[PDB]
């Protein structure tokens, strides 16, 4: 069994093979598209309040399998078990939040046209094809699926090939909730199967969460097929610390921001840009706090980090570390693959990272922090924006005026001032530049895949 | 002077060559990209109220050359002079409308996050590349340029090669208004130049109004370069008349909707779908009302129709008519090229048009009406959605409940009930399916090319 024929699950903590699943054939793809078409046809006619109730049924079904879901996440991609439980809880609360606030976001919108002649309606678009990654096997799916389905659309998941056990579990949860299989479906399609579905008329639009290379390859096919796409393609988020900052809170938020999910977060704090006056105190405190993180078996709740999900990606990450050191960076912590059958990489800190270095120009999708010195606040802003990515950012300073001014000049989709960066249903999510385009969550995730339809009566 | 080397303007009323313009070279492309990046860098730092005032300056500069602009539009693409003056007036009013209402649409947006810790901000994205067509040489530019610039973005126009006289005049209007260097620019680029700019990092996003073939070609490039794009690619709008409709008003709106701008409108009434009970009366009234339209020299205000804009497109439209007649349709009016040096095509009506015929499946971008009989309202809805396009639609019926129900099932971005289909700053514009995606005008045209940015303080 090889990836050329099957999707393979391997426990990254032990290296043992878990499951295999062959790619969907031509009959599977045709059957999936037929049921998605029939499902949307009936789902688009349901009441908005009925769909809001079905969202609550999803949240109830998810909580009824919360531990079964979290264990599957931890087993397949190595997430610490309490972070997998938090992912389940966050995904279930998302169902309840959209159930309460979603309908009001989908109400018809009045216009300034006289005599109440014109309103704006949010109509369903069709079946949305979703390409999702492995770092949050449940949350990445629910973040789009919940608002997409509430808007009357269908959702067809093409999950990452190393988390198909999570994909089947999610499908079972939707089945438990009474969601018709044409409204929520899934396929184990290879890249050619995705290309075929993008060209198929039964797919209305596409959404992609993954690498820059995956978004560029899929975004070109969606544009060629005249399908709207939303791309969320990770980032290299800057974490700015000025001299007047709450240093202790900044270090806590820096450590959590970088090493959450063993570093494998799109909006993780990756480029730490510290003003020169406070850089020595920050660096020493950051290394001390990163060194206090326990790493090991993700089923053991005492471990803050588990193994990295993919063996090839740990090799890639370590190669990036070696290149950055060879270019002139200094190693302050970790920086070597752990011996054993597990895919473990320890918390790592690189200092003296200049903008020409690998760890500054590429996404470090693992437990490796890069620390860059800034001459002043203007240099820090320039350093923050000197990146191909632009998903999110953090600024730590007690001068809230300068913080508001820097936020307005940061080329990214989210700015956190003196706090922990995270995605939340109540705020928009998504970035600019090579991080992609399109916004998720809040009312943005509801409207991105809606036919915004003007209805105008008696225009005479 | 071959189109392979020059952009050529030809007066369609006479056939005389007006002007030539060589394609921009590599230097000209690089120059404009540099000035656009420099212009945006300074424009994004200005106050919103300053830019709103400059919008009022654009409207003043446009009205100051209103007759010069309208005569240029009529001369280069053949629009009747009164419709060209109306285009100028509608474009200037768009400047004042966004100047008044735009700033409020760009204010920070509150969230449900407790204690007012998180707001949504609408930041500029960058320089927007615009690919525009010849049917509304001014309005198509202003519909995007006014909101795009107001939100702090830059605007780089690649106009259609037969209306470069209009493009230069438009640039003179922005220069008269004092719009800075690089905020509004334009290039006489060929298709390779557009490809070069899409791949360039100084272009943040693309917008395209034109054919389906152009949108698929440009949209594929935008996705491959990870640039968001908005595509408005014309349509084959259905015009449904049920048995209980106000026949007199329906006929007036049908004629106005089809033969406006000599039929060269993306949201024109193209496929007339009439219930069998009223079909005979509607058809006879439509032929008689279309026959009362005067056609001739577009500088003469008595003429409701001018010549078609492009000689090759009249040849293609007539080929579409000949194919539809050969497929079984009946000719009720017009249906033959006018002899002479002008590019004149008379008002044309085709009856017995079935869904398998050319005039039903392709866009008839000229003064040719296609009439299809529907058995009942359910059949009319099926006939309306049986199309690759989906820009807009019209329903005429005194049963307003049935009209609203059909509007919810019409696969298009705009539905007009008992009125005249048109675009308006106060409502959304844009469609679905092969008509493209994304919305223009109102707050949609402002937000499509904004960096929607979450700003969240003290998330602890
Ligand atoms: N949160 C994120 O944005 C995120 C998540 C995981 C990985 N990544 C980035 O991607 C890197 C590699 O991890 P990865 O290999 O899993 O990313 P990936 O893009 O290759 O996998 C992401 C998803 O896209 C799909 N995909 C990839 N190429 C495709 C194609 N040509 N056609 C159709 N579908 C395609 C994959 O099957 C998967 O479902 C990581 O190191 C990280 O930099 C980002
Ligand atoms: N309002 C509209 O949506 C609209 C306007 C004009 C034409 N059309 C449709 O298109 C048909 C032909 O008219 P047209 O020739 O002007 O359409 P067109 O698409 O060829 O021209 C539209 C614009 O797109 C540009 N363009 C086209 N192909 C391109 C490419 N490969 N790369 C870069 N830029 C490209 C053109 O230069 C022009 O500026 C019409 O008969 C009608 O069906 C629609």
Nearest-CA distance from A259 to chain B in Å? 17
Q: Are B5 and B22 in contact (CB under 8 A)?
A: yes
Rounded Cα gap, residues B22 and A79, in angstroms: 60
Q: Which of A195, A211, A231 to mutate to test the pocket of ligand 1 (most atoms within 8 A of CB)?
A: A211
- Tokens linked to B200: 């360039």
Instruction: Choose the closest CB to A123 out of B118, B212, B408.
Output: B408
Atom of ligand 2 nearest to the CA of B213: 19
Nearest listed ligand to the Cα of residue A131: 1
Q: Which residue of B has its CA nearest to A253?
A: B460
Q: Which residue of A has its CA nearest to B389?
A: A226
The resolution, in angstroms to one decimal, equals 2.3
At how many degrees (to 10) do helices B81-105 and B139-150 cross?
10
**Disruptive mutation site among B388, B394, B452 for chain A (greatest number of A CBs within 10 Å):** B452
Instruction: Choose the closest CB to B223 out of A125, A222, A412.
Output: A222
B55: Cα within 13 Å, side-chain hemisphere: 29
Count of C-beta atoms within a 10 Å radius of residue A450? 18
Helix (H/G/I), strand (E/B), else coil: B165: helix
Q: For atom 30 of ligand 1, which residue has the closest CA? A: A191
The pair phi, psi for residue A398, each rounded to 5°, is -85, -5
CA B66 to chain centroid, in Å, comes to 20
Rounded Cα gap, residues B255 and A192, in angstroms: 47
Which of these, A235, A253, A287, lies nearest to A396 by C-alpha position?
Answer: A253
Question: What does B20-84 look like in DSSP terms, one character per residue?
Answer: EEEPP-HHHHHHHHHHHHHHHHHHTTS-HHHHHHHHHHHHHHHHHTHHHHHHHHHHHH---HHHH
Q: Which residue of A has its CA nearest to B118?
A: A427
Q: Look-up: residue for tokens 């927007």?
A: B128
**Disruptive mutation site among A153, A386, A420, A454 for chain B (greatest number of B CBs within 10 Å):** A454
Query: What dihedral do alpha carbons A92, A98, A99, A105 form, nearest 10°?
Result: 180
Which of these, B90, B110, B202, lies nearest to B153 by C-alpha position?
Answer: B202
Rounded Cα gap, residues B97 and A304, in angstroms: 55
Q: For atom 15 of ligand 1, which residue has the closest CA? A: A211
Nearest-CA distance from A416 to chain B in Å? 5
CA-based angle B193:B195:B200, to the nearest 5? 95
Could B460 and A220 be called an inter-chain contact, meaning their C-beta atoms sit closer than 8 Å? no
CA B213 to chain centroid, in Å, comes to 15
CA B29 to chain centroid, in Å, comes to 26
Q: Determine the distance separating the centroid of ligand 2 and the alpha carbon of B210, expressed in angstroms.
A: 4
Reduce the secondary structure of chain A to three states and give it as a string: CCCCCEEEEECCCCCCEEEEEECCCHHHHHHHHHHHHHHHHHHCCCCHHHHHHHHHHHHHHHHHCHHHHHHHHHHHHCCCHHHHHHHHHHHHHHHHHHHHHHHHHCCCEECCCHHHCEEEEEEECCEEEEECCCCCCCHHHHHHHHHHHHCCCEEEEECCCCCHHHHHHHHHHHHHCCCCCCCEEECCCCHHHHHHHHHCCCEEEEEEECCHHHHHHHHHHHHHCCCCEEEECCCCEEEEECCCCCHHHHHHHHHHHHHHHHHCCCCCEEEEEEEHHHHHHHHHHHHHHHHCCCECCCCCCCCCECCCCCHHHHHHHHHHHHHHHHCCCEEEECCCCCCCCCCCCCCEEEECCCCCCHHHHCCCCCCEEEEEEECCHHHHHHHHHCCCCCCCEEEECCCHHHHHHHHHHCCCCEEEECCCCCCCCCCCECCCHHHEECCECCCHHHHCCEEEEEEEECCC
Residues from chain A contacting residue B228 (CB–CB below 8 Å)? 437-438
Annotated binding-site residue? A158: yes
Q: Which residue of A has its CA nearest to B437?
A: A228
Q: What share of chain B is helix, strand, coil (3-state, %, to 5)?
A: 45, 20, 35
The DSSP H or E segment spanning B415 is strand B414-417
CA-based angle B83:B89:B94, to the nearest 5? 125
Rounded Cα gap, residues A396 and A254, in angstroms: 10
Q: Which residue in A76, A87, A232, A275 is the catalytic one?
A: A232
Q: Give catalytic status of residue A266 as yes or no.
A: yes
Reduce the secondary structure of A83-113 to three states and give it as a string: HHHHHHHHHHHHHHHHHHHHHHHCCCEECCC
Domains present along chain B, CATH in parentheses: 6-233+435-456 (3.40.605.10), 237-422 (3.40.309.10)
Q: For atom 15 of ligand 2, which residue has the closest CA? A: B211
The pair phi, psi for residue B21, each rounded to 5°, is -155, 115
> What number of helices (H) and strands (E) belong to chain B?
15, 18
Rounded Cα gap, residues B128 and A297, in angstroms: 49
Alpha helices in B78-211 (DSSP H): 81-105, 139-150, 164-176, 191-199
- Tokens linked to B122: 């609408």
Q: Look-up: residue for tokens 């690998």?
A: A358
Q: Which residue in A266, A412, A421, A450 is the catalytic one?
A: A266
Query: What dihedral do alpha carbons A305, A309, A312, A315 form, nearest 10°?
Result: -10
CA distances (Å), origin A128, targets A202, A216, B22, B153, B312: 9, 18, 44, 30, 39
Could B457 and A418 be called an inter-chain contact, meaning their C-beta atoms sit closer than 8 Å? yes
Q: Are B146 and B58 in contact (CB under 8 A)?
A: yes
Rounded Cα gap, residues B354 and B226, in angstroms: 41
Rounded Cα gap, residues A84 and A73, in angstroms: 6
- DSSP 8-state code for residue B337: P
Q: Are A307 and A342 in contact (CB under 8 A)?
A: yes
Rounded Cα gap, residues A294 and A346, in angstroms: 9
Nearest-CA distance from B351 to chain A in Å? 27
Helix (H/G/I), strand (E/B), else coil: B181: strand
């Amino acid at each position: 069994i090889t990836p050329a024929t099957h999707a393979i699950s391997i426990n990254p903590a032990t290296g043992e093979q878990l499951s295999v699943l062959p790619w969907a054939g031509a009959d599977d793809i045709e059957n999936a598209l037929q049921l998605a078409a029939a499902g949307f046809r009936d789902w688009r006619e349901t009441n908005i309040d009925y769909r809001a109730e079905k969202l609550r049924d999803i949240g109830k079904a998810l909580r009824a399998r919360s531990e079964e879901m979290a264990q599957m996440i931890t087993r397949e991609m190595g997430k610490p078990i309490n972070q997998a439980r938090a992912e389940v809880a966050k995904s279930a609360n998302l169902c309840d939040w959209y159930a309460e606030h979603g309908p009001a976001m989908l109400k018809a919108e009045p216009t300034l046209v006289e005599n109440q002649q014109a309103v704006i309606e949010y109509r369903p678009l069709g079946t949305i094809l979703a390409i999702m990654p492995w770092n949050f096997p449940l949350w990445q799916v629910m973040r789009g699926a919940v608002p997409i389905i509430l808007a009357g659309n269908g959702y067809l998941l093409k999950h990452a090939p190393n988390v198909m056990g999570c994909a089947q579990l999610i499908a079972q949860v939707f089945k438990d909730a009474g969601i018709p299989q044409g409204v929520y479906g899934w396929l184990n399609a290879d890249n050619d199967g995705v290309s075929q579905m993008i060209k198929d008329s039964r797919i209305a639009a596409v959404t992609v969460t993954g690498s820059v290379r995956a978004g560029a390859a899929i975004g070109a096919q969606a544009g060629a097929a005249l399908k709207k796409c939303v791309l969320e393609l990770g980032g290299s988020d800057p974490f700015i610390v000025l001299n007047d900052a709450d240093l202790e809170l900044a270090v806590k938020a820096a450590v959590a921001g970088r090493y959450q999910n063993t570093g494998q977060v799109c909006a993780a704090a990756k480029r730490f840009i510290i003003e020169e006056g406070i850089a020595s105190a920050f660096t020493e405190r950051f290394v001390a706090a990163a060194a206090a993180l326990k790493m090991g078996d993700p089923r053991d709740e005492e471990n803050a980090l588990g193994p990295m999900a993919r063996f090839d990606l740990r090799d890639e990450l370590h190669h990036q570390v070696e290149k950055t050191l060879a270019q002139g960076a200094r190693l302050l912590l970790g920086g070597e693959k752990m011996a054993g059958a597990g895919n473990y990489y320890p918390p790592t800190v690189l200092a003296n990272v200049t903008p020409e270095m690998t760890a500054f120009r590429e996404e470090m999708f693992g437990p490796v922090a890069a620390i860059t010195i800034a001459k002043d606040a203007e240099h820090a802003l320039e350093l923050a924006n000197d990146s191909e990515f632009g998903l999110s950012a953090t600024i730590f300073t007690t001068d809230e005026t300068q913080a508001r001014q820097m936020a307005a000049r940061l080329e990214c989709g989210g700015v956190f001032i003196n706090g922990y960066c995270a995605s939340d249903a109540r705020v928009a999510f998504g970035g600019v530049k090579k991080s992609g385009f399109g916004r998720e969550l809040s009312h943005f995730g509801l409207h991105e895949f809606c036919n915004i339809q003007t209805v105008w009566k008696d225009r005479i």
